[PDB]
Structure formats: structure tokens, C-alpha cells
């Protein structure tokens, strides 16, 4: 009943995220979570377009059924699914050649836009790269639990950090769950 | 003699199902039991014929000797050696982009018979995919616990679970064992 | 001085013994030793050649100095620096098919000899498959605790056991070291 | 603040150290530290020429901005950024096969210098091989604790230890990070 219904839909939760780490990071293998990271511009280019990549191509090879949303303030404009941002300090003059740097710390914000049917990163000045969308499906598990399936929307947030700035770029993938009940729902039930 | 007995049959019976992870599933290794799992169609399509393929290929790669086994009531039919049934909802309506589903979850089995020497699966609305088959086996190493040969005949399931519909699908391999004297067992044994 | 000569030693074995390791056992990796195995026809096969292999070309490719040794009773015969041998049931009529075995369980060992610069395996009657060898070196690091070299012979073997019969068969490669002062040793040693 | 500033100095220098492993060691992977080491003499050149060229490819690579740096008394001559150091016995005749050797242990030190933007290793008688050089990076992060980022120089050390003479060489890369101001540091901060 209701102790069940909460460890399901936790686990809801856990599988959905893990099979995200799976479809869209670049040679994701369990087990590797925090230590997870790119060391080469390649890697990194490669990583952030894969990930792109399956979100277009989710319906194709996913073995779940998720509906892309549309449309939200931050920082999805209308229309758009996915927002690949890139925040890097407004001046970033960095020689250490010569000892020196000039540095304007103020953080840019630059977000692409990308609606569900080139990139030029500034590695010395850039803080991070995002990777924002959300997904919806049905939680069918609960009619084992005997009860209506419920409507979750998944925010997927792909960070690669480089606020340390240290020639290495940890990448994790985090997601939030928003649960409610389905516009309508109908499971035949007599026999 | 008896309680070594008892430890060399539980670790014959280990060894074959060990072995049995490493023929039948793609890309096994061990240690990787309660996390073995598959992520895209690709992937458990390939999963699901390379297991099928493995089974008609067992005579000529198997490091043991295996022999067939046909019938039974569940599910071989007669002359069938491996049975691959898909379970889904009579019916599944899921449509998360409009945040609804119409369901009938009333579960349907359909099983595909393949004798001893093609699929559409559901995902919307699957259940799970099962290989079941039967091999035999002499238990040749009682020899060293002066002992005749057992008859072993090894139920093998492989189960790849889809009841979460979490994108995320678990593969497992199981066993059962059941034991019993040979027909017609001969140790030469005087020397 | 002389704990740290002893240990010094048994550091020596067991770093010459993880070398052979990775040179003679096909696809080994540090920490597998005890679930190294072979489940295919082909993978054992490549296993018992690769092992015969890198001894040939042994020379050419390590990273140590190794000299051959020939000769000896068991089961060396003279010119003899590697014997692949072979032990299986005199008679061993396997047939699960049809619950019967006869066999005569007497061991008959085949081995075929290799002198430094095919084989037909009875997999239903296997007991198991051994490659002996004899490597000599010199232990040089002995200078760095003021005592000279010692001269080493490594008595090799790799086991292929098919015991359990179980379609699993784990691969080990073990050694013993015989120890004794070299024939003529000089250490320049004035300035 | 100040526990602060030290923890995250620190953990600089460490990710930096990480980097480098991932960059410089062909084939390191997290977590292989203490057993990442050569077993043939191809790994040995492959794993050698893959460092000093990813030093060279370093601007067009790695995701951080270093400064090459050129001299110092050892074993940089003027103008050299990399040094590949050979150390071996001045006399090594090491005849295993005939138990005999005859040595001369003075270490003699044969080292190429390689200037930012062919080896003939001597295996039976190799104390080790070093590569050697000095990268400089700001340490950015800094801004995050609202402090003026700060002025790194890596020494960095790799070794290939034959010090066993075992047929095992361990691969290792070591860091020490000398820490100063920069000549000149500017961070606008108005707003």
C-alpha cells in the first residue's frame, strides 16, 4: 500500500536517473559516478554533443516513453526543449607565461537553444557548461501496487564543472521530480 | 565422502550457472550481477539473440557437454527446446505528452518456440521478455569423491525486467537444479 | 641488511610472478586471479597458445632477462623447455543426452614437447591442461642492499583445470623459486 | 576564508595531479595507481613517447592553460622544457643462462632534452627512466573565496622503476607545486 507506494516511486526516481546517465553521458559505466570527468577538449566536445545527440534521438532508442516539455522561464525560451549554456568571466585574460592575468569575474551567461524535432568554448575563461530539459512519462510500476499510474516530469541537469579550473572536468547528471496526478487517467478493472 | 558431497554438487551447480552468465549474456563479466542491465532496443535486442544464437550454438562452443531438452507443459511446446515469451498489457494507451493512458492490465503472454538444431517487442507496454530452456548434464567430477556420475538437468531463465518501466531494464540469469541416479552409469573399477 | 634481504627476495617472486602473469595469460588484469577462466572452445584454445606463444618470443618482448632451462624428469624431455600437457579419462563415453556415461576413470597424460629457439582436446573427457616451464634470471636488485646478485630458476605452471567439468574453466599460473649463488659473480666495487 | 583557502590549494593541486595522469600515462584509469605499470618493451616505448608527446600537444589538448617553463640546473640544460633521463649501470654483463654476471653498479645517467614547441634503452642493465618538467597555471578558483587567484609551478615527475629488475616496470607520476604571487594580478571589483 502507502509504505510500498513511497519506496517504488523512489526507486521510480533512481532507475529513470540512472538510465539517463546511461543515454547521454559519453562512456558512463556504473560504479564511476564521481570520478566521472573529461581531461581533453575532444572528450569534452564529444561528450556535450552526445549528449544533444541522444536527446534528439531519445524516441528512436530509449526503452522508456518520455514526452519532451516545452517552454519555462529559466532558461528554456518557447519552443525549446534543451538549453546548452556556457558561463565563462566576462574578461578573462589569463597569461601564465607571464605571471600575470586581468580579470573581469563577472559571469556571462551564453545558452543555446534546442527544440525537440557549433559551439565555441572559451577554456580558459569558462566556469561551466549546462545541459538543461525535462522529460515526462507515466509511472506504470504502480498498478502492481494496485493503484493509478502516476504523471512524473523529470528536470535533467548536465554539469560539466570547471570552477576549479584544474585541467580537469568532472560531468554529473542530477534530476528533480515533479509528481501529480495524470490529466486522465483509466485503468479497465473488472475482468 | 557426504558433507563433501554436498559442497561439490551446490559448487557443480555454481560453476555451470556461472558459465551459463558468461555464454548466454552479451557483454557479461563477473561482479557485475545486480547491475547488469540494458538501456536502449539495440542493446536488448542484441541481448536477446545472442542468447537465443548461443543456445543453437552450444554444442560447438561450450566447454561442456550439454544435451538438449524437449517438451514440458511451461511453456515448450512439444519439440521445443527454448521458449522466448513477451509479456505486455492487453492494453496500453501511454501518452505522456498529453498526460494521459488508457490501460487494460491484464497481461499477455506471447511465446515464441525454438527448437534445438524475429520479435516485436512492446516497450510501452511490456512487462518483461523471458528465455526459458532445459540442458543436461553428467556430474563427472563425483569420480575424485569416489562417487558414481550424477544426472543433472539445469532449468535455465533469463529474465530482463521491464515491470518498473523505468528505461532501465535488468538482466538476470537463474537456475534451478534438479538431480537425480543415470539411466545406465558404468565406472570401470579395478585397475 | 638481512630482513630487508628477505623480504627484498620474496618481492622479487612475486613481482617476476605477476609479470608472467601478464605476458603468458591471455587477457589477464591485475585482481581477476581468482575468477580468471575460460567458458569458449576458442577462448581456451587462444589461452594455451598465446601462453606457448609469448614463451617463444619471450626474448623479444620482455621487459626482464630470462634465460631457458632444459631438461629435467618431469615431464621435460631433453632438448625440452616447454611441455603442454594433456590429461584426460582412458575411456570416457559421456552421453547425457541419453542419462549414460561409461568410463574408465585412469588419467592418461599426453604432452607435447617445445624446445626454445596443433593439439586436439577431449573437452567431455578432460580432466585438465598444464604448461611447464623453467626460467632463469638473475637477481640484480640485490645491489641495492650491498649483496650480490643471486641467480634464480622460476619453475612455471599455468593450470587449465576442467575438474569440476562445470563448462568453466579457471586458469591459474603459479611458481616456485629455487635460489642459489651464481657460478661466477663480480661486482666492481672501489671507485 | 582561510581553512578555506588551504583545503582548496590542496584539492588544486590534486585535480591538477589527476590531470596529469590522465594526459601524460597511456591507458591509466582512476583507482590503478599502485599496480599501473609495463610489461613489454613495446607498452615501455609506447607508454615513454605518449608522455613526451602529449607534452607536446599540450596548448591544442588539456582543458587548463599551462606555461611551459625552460631551464634550471637538473636536468633541464638551457632552453629545455623536457628532460627523458636513461639511468643504467656502467657495466652490466648479466648472463643468466650461464649463471654469471659481471658489474660495474656506478649509475650513469644519460638524459634527452626536449625543447617546447629515438631511445635506445638499455633493459638488462636499467635502473629506471624519468621524465622531467615544469608546467605553470593560475590558480583561478581563488576568485570563488574572493581571493586574487595565485601563481602555480608543477614539477612534475614521471617514473618508469626497473629497480627490481623483476620483468614488472611500475609507472608513477609525482607532483611537487611551488606557490607565489603573481607579477601582476587585476580583478576588476566595482561592479
Redesign the interface.
Known amino acids: 500500500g502507502s509504505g510500498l507506494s513511497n519506496q517504488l516511486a523512489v ?2 526516481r533512481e ?2 536517473t ?3 546517465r ?2 547521454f553521458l559519453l562512456g558512463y559505466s ?2 564511476a559516478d564521481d ?1 566521472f570527468a ?5 572528450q ?1 566536445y564529444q561528450a556535450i554533443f552526445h549528449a544533444v545527440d541522444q536527446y534528439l534521438a531519445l524516441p ?9 516539455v516545452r517552454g519555462g522561464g529559466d532558461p528554456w525560451t518557447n519552443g525549446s526543449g534543451l538549453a546548452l549554456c556556457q558561463r565563462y568571466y566576462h ?1 578573462g585574460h ?13 559571469v556571462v551567461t551564453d545558452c543555446i537553444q534546442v527544440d525537440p524535432p557549433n559551439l565555441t568554448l572559451k ?2 575563461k569558462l566556469v561551466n557548461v549546462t545541459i538543461h530539459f525535462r522529460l ?6 504502480s ?2 501496487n494496485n493503484e493509478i ?1 502516476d ?1 512524473y516530469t523529470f528536470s535533467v541537469l548536465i554539469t560539466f564543472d ?8 568532472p560531468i554529473s547528471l542530477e534530476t528533480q521530480a515533479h509528481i501529480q496526478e ?8 473488472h ?1
Chains 1, 2, 3, 4 share one sequence.
Do not use: W
Open positions: 526507486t521510480f532507475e529513470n540512472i538510465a539517463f546511461h543515454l556504473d560504479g570520478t573529461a581531461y581533453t577538449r575532444e569534452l528512436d532508442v530509449s526503452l522508456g516513453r518520455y514526452a519532451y574578461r589569463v597569461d601564465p607565461a607571464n605571471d600575470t592575468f586581468d580579470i573581469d569575474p563577472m577554456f580558459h515526462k512519462t507515466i509511472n506504470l510500476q498498478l502492481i499510474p504523471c570547471n570552477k576549479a579550473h584544474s585541467g580537469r572536468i495524470c490529466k486522465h487517467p483509466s485503468v479497465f478493472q475482468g
